[PDB]
Amino acid sequence: DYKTFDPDLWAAIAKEEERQEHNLELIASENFVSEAVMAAQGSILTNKYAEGYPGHRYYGGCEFVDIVENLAIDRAKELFGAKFANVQPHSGSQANTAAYLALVEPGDTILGMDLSAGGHLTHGSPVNFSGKTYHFVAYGVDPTTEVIDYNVVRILARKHQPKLIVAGASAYGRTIDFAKFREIADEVGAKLMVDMAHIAGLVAAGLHPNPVPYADITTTTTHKTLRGPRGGMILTNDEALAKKINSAVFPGIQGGPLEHVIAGKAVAFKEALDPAFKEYSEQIIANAKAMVKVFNQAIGTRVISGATDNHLMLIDVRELGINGKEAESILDSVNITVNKNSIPFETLSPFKTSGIRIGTPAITTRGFKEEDAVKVAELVVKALQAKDDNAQLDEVKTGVRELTEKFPLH
Amino acid sequence: VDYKTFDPDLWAAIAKEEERQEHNLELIASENFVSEAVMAAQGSILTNKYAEGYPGHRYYGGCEFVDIVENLAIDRAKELFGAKFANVQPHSGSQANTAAYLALVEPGDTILGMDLSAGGHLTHGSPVNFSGKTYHFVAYGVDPTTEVIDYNVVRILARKHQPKLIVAGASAYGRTIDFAKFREIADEVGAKLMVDMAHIAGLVAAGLHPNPVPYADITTTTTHKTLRGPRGGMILTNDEALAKKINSAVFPGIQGGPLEHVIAGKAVAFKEALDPAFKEYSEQIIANAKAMVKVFNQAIGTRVISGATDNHLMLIDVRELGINGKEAESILDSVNITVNKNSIPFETLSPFKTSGIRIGTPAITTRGFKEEDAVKVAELVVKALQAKDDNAQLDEVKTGVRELTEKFPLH
Ligand SMILES: O=c1c2cc(O)c(O)cc2oc2cc(O)c([C@@H]3O[C@H](CO)[C@@H](O)[C@H](O)[C@H]3O)c(O)c12
Numbered sequence: 059d060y061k062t063f064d065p066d067l068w069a070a071i072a073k074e075e076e077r078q079e080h081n082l083e084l085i086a087s088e089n090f091v092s093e094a095v096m097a098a099q100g101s102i103l104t105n106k107y108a109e110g111y112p113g114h115r116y117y118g119g120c121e122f123v124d125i126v127e128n129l130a131i132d133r134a135k136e137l138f139g140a141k142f143a144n145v146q147p148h149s150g151s152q153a154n155t156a157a158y159l160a161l162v163e164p165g166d167t168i169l170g171m172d173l174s175a176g177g178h179l180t181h182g183s184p185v186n187f188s189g190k191t192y193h194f195v196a197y198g199v200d201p202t203t204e205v206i207d208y209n210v211v212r213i214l215a216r217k218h219q220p221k222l223i224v225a226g227a228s229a230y231g232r233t234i235d236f237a238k239f240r241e242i243a244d245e246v247g248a249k250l251m252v253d254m255a256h257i258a259g260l261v262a263a264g265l266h267p268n269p270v271p272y273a274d275i276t277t278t279t280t281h282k283t284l285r286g287p288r289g290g291m292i293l294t295n296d297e298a299l300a301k302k303i304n305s306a307v308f309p310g311i312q313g314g315p316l317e318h319v320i321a322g323k324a325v326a327f328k329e330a331l332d333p334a335f336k337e338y339s340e341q342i343i344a345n346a347k348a349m350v351k352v353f354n355q356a357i358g359t360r361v362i363s364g365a366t367d368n369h370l371m372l373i374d375v376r377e378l379g380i381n382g383k384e385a386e387s388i389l390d391s392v393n394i395t396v397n398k399n400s401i402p403f404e405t406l407s408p409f410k411t412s413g414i415r416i417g418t419p420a421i422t423t424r425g426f427k428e429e430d431a432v433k434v435a436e437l438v439v440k441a442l443q444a445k446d447d448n449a450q451l452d453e454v455k456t457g458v459r460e461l462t463e464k465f466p467l468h
Numbered sequence: 469v470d471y472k473t474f475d476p477d478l479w480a481a482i483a484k485e486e487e488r489q490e491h492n493l494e495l496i497a498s499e500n501f502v503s504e505a506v507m508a509a510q511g512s513i514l515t516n517k518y519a520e521g522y523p524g525h526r527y528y529g530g531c532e533f534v535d536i537v538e539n540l541a542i543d544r545a546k547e548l549f550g551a552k553f554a555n556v557q558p559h560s561g562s563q564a565n566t567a568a569y570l571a572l573v574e575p576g577d578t579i580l581g582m583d584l585s586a587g588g589h590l591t592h593g594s595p596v597n598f599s600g601k602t603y604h605f606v607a608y609g610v611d612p613t614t615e616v617i618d619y620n621v622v623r624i625l626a627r628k629h630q631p632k633l634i635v636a637g638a639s640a641y642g643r644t645i646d647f648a649k650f651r652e653i654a655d656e657v658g659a660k661l662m663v664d665m666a667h668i669a670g671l672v673a674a675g676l677h678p679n680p681v682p683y684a685d686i687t688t689t690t691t692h693k694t695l696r697g698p699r700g701g702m703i704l705t706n707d708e709a710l711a712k713k714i715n716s717a718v719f720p721g722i723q724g725g726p727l728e729h730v731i732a733g734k735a736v737a738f739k740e741a742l743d744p745a746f747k748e749y750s751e752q753i754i755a756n757a758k759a760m761v762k763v764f765n766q767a768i769g770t771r772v773i774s775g776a777t778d779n780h781l782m783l784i785d786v787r788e789l790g791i792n793g794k795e796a797e798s799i800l801d802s803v804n805i806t807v808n809k810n811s812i813p814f815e816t817l818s819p820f821k822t823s824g825i826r827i828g829t830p831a832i833t834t835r836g837f838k839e840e841d842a843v844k845v846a847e848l849v850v851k852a853l854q855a856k857d858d859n860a861q862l863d864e865v866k867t868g869v870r871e872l873t874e875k876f877p878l879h
């Protein structure tokens with residue numbers, strides 16, 4: 059047996075399988091993929107070099123690998139209504155790198171969502187390729203509502219004259235009005251790129267406005283609400299952008315594609331075509347709203363913007379005398395996994411932040427219903443309220459073990 | 469199982485591709501067959517963990533055990549190649565090189581790299597690639613009559629163009645690369661030295677090819693060629709100041725979350741490469757390649773670029789048979805022999821035709837082929853290309869392929 063020859067590695071993997079079983083995973087960008095997705099990723103497709111695209115490869119022997127990639131491409135067009143799909147990006151970051159190369163020139167001005175207001179690293183950060191290569195200007199959320207102020211987005215567009223407007227977010231819990239971004243982009247002659255990585259599954263289920271008809275290019279990851287393997291994807295409705303997208307991915311920034319991962323994408327896409335996937339996605343949002351109700355009625359946990367429309371929420375934790383890294387460390391000690399996160403107009407350093415981010419896709423996958431999501435939010439509140447009270451925290455751990463035992467993952 | 473009944477479209481394609489790997493001679497020089505341990509790591513639950521950052525400095529909670537896995541990969545890599553620093557997060561050879569350039573040069577800087585038709589890779593300066601687009605590449609090639617690198621020409625070009633960086637390493641070069649000479653030339657001109665050892669990393673690990681890690685400022689590699697690991701990249705260095713620039717360039721520079729299930733497979737494969745048995749496998753790769761070159765040298769119409777090999781691969785100019793590279797690729801595929809077309813030095817034909825094919829032995833060697841089996845493979849390739857689409861001879865090639873694949877099953 060192969061595990062006998064490398065006990066150090068396989069023990070660590072076994073321990074990670076137990077950690078996923080015994081913890082409440084509340085990181086908003088995580089999920090648990092099906093056994094079929096993992097089997098695709100563990101198949102012999104990892105052995106095939108397949109540079110190029112189906113029917114135009116640079117190697118012999120791709121006749122069956124082309125089926126796999128065709129299924130991923132075609133199911134993505136079916137799920138999202140795009141005319142063109144590229145499923146080769148190794149990650150969301152690569153997808154966004156290629157999308158920019160098809161839309162703008164180095165030095166061009168791009169208007170993206172501010173990092174502390176929900177934007178992602180690849181939407182302009184100075185330590186990222188995006189911030190180094192292009193001239194990024196940020197838009198945020200209104201200080202009092204903590205939702206996007208589209209009139210201020212319009213102001214920024216008019217003053218800065220961006221070549222491209224990016225919409226989409228990592229930590230924004232409200233509906234994004236893509237039609238408004240498109241109208242604003244049209245007003246100043248800018249293009250529109252939407253990064254729907256977080257909400258892609260909700261979009262496919264029809265529970266969030268679809269950006270594909272509005273954006274020049276839509277990027278996404280395959281692993282968040284879509285519940286697929288880690289990787290990227292690029293969609294468009296314009297054949298001329300599709301040609302630029304395809305060249306930017308390969309030979310532009312990538313080489314061989316990961317066809318075992320692409321098989322996993324194809325597996326996940328057909329799971330998302332099943333009607334059960336819409337029910338899953340509805341439950342995700344119902345669970346999230348139920349948790350927001352608990353935190354709203356709780357002393358010390360302020361919900362940014364006061365509501366959620368999707369899978370995630372940001373909690374301001376300052377009124378409990380902790381910062382984000384503390385609240386995350388507290389929750390880690392009771393087997394509840396979140397992450398620290400900046401809040402709008404954040405005043406602490408990124409290494410501390412004032413908040414945590416919570417999302418329900420992973421616990422929804424385990425089978426949690428609204429009642430259970432309510433219990434999770436209550437245990438999160440009690441763990442944070444329990445200032446140093448190991449009596450209270452051990453009750454939380456017991457509450458966590460009740461939930462995880464009720465909903466086995468394996 | 470049941471999930472295969474949910475999706476026959478997909479699972480029937482994977483089954484056909486299993487049958488094709490079983491029934492074909494896989495002679496693509498950059499492919500291999502990974503172990504069931506590597507595949508089980510890639511099909512593990514590690515795909516579920518967001519682990520942005522590096523071990524002990526993650527941006528998410530819960531990374532206790534993925535840190536063990538990634539640190540195993542990092543440490544096994546350092547032990548394998550003797551490097552003080554190792555980054556195992558690059559998603560691919562291309563991302564590894566992207567990040568390495570970011571740590572060494574600025575946009576517009578002059579870089580000297582191996583010409584693509586002489587054996588250099590896309591990321592060594594092609595103008596349709598980020599490398600040629602972002603930096604000023606000047607190419608060195610091979611001598612026309614010997615078809616090996618002329619190191620005086622490299623020195624001349626280094627001196628005329630004053631590169632900030634010299635890149636050595638190849639994807640279609642079958643001869644020993646003298647990293648010491650590249651280091652001399654770099655020093656004389658004041659340039660840094662980057663070596664992309666993707667193709668030969670397994671041979672380097674086994675001591676069958678000079679090691680670039682002590683000479684190069686940064687060494688990059690894929691994990692899936694002669695190293696026989698999962699599909700991915702890696703960056704090695706001995707300088708601590710570069711290691712910090714490398715780590716920053718990978719994340720948050722060009723990537724986000726690492727693929728920790730793939731990194732698990734890298735740790736598996738590096739351990740398999742530390743086993744003494746891996747050195748025996750690597751030697752059989754070279755012995756098999758040399759046995760194939762001997763056959764092609766003797767046959768009429770199959771000319772081996774440079775007349776010999778020192779490593780796992782060989783380039784064959786097929787023009788004297790009245791075919792181009794794509795036609796040869798298609799003929800061979802029709803008799804269950806898988807290669808890729810490939811440019812030859814001083815390529816006269818279109819990039820969509822090319823003048824030759826590239827053949828390498830790592831995959832058939834992993835199946836257990838020995839030199840007498842390698843000899844048979846090469847004789848079959850010759851027969852197929854010489855059969856002016858005579859079905860009787862082509863079917864004898866198919867029979868010969870069946871014999872070898874049944875003699876060395878893949879399971
Ligand atoms: O800012 C940095 C940063 C700055 C540096 O100087 C440096 O060396 C490294 C850095 O790593 C980062 C890594 C990150 O994941 C994020 C942000 O975390 C949040 C997690 O929910 C997401 O909502 C954001 O989408 C995501 O982009 C970051 O903001 C940063």
Ligand SMILES: O=c1c2cc(O)c(O)cc2oc2cc(O)c([C@@H]3O[C@H](CO)[C@@H](O)[C@H](O)[C@H]3O)c(O)c12
Nearest residue numbers: 109116309584587588589590596639640808810819
């Ligand atoms: O040049 C192109 C190219 C240009 C385009 O415009 C385009 O759309 C696609 C293209 O795909 C390519 C794919 C390739 O594998 C190669 C080269 O093949 C050989 C090994 O297989 C090696 O000698 C090189 O290491 C390798 O990089 C290429 O040179 C190219």
Ligand SMILES: Cc1ncc(COP(=O)(O)O)c(CN[C@@H](CO)C(=O)O)c1O
Nearest residue numbers: 087149150151178227228253255724725
């Ligand atoms: C909108 C968007 N686009 C791109 C990416 C990056 O994808 P990658 O990690 O696969 O490279 C992310 C991941 N976002 C991470 C934060 O870095 C998260 O946990 O939410 C994203 O949210």
Ligand SMILES: Cc1ncc(COP(=O)(O)O)c(CN[C@@H](CO)C(=O)O)c1O
Nearest residue numbers: 313314498560561562589638639666667
């Ligand atoms: C030396 C070297 N460095 C980097 C890469 C890129 O690796 P990637 O495909 O994983 O991105 C390659 C790919 N090698 C391909 C050529 O495209 C091949 O079949 O040989 C390489 O040979």
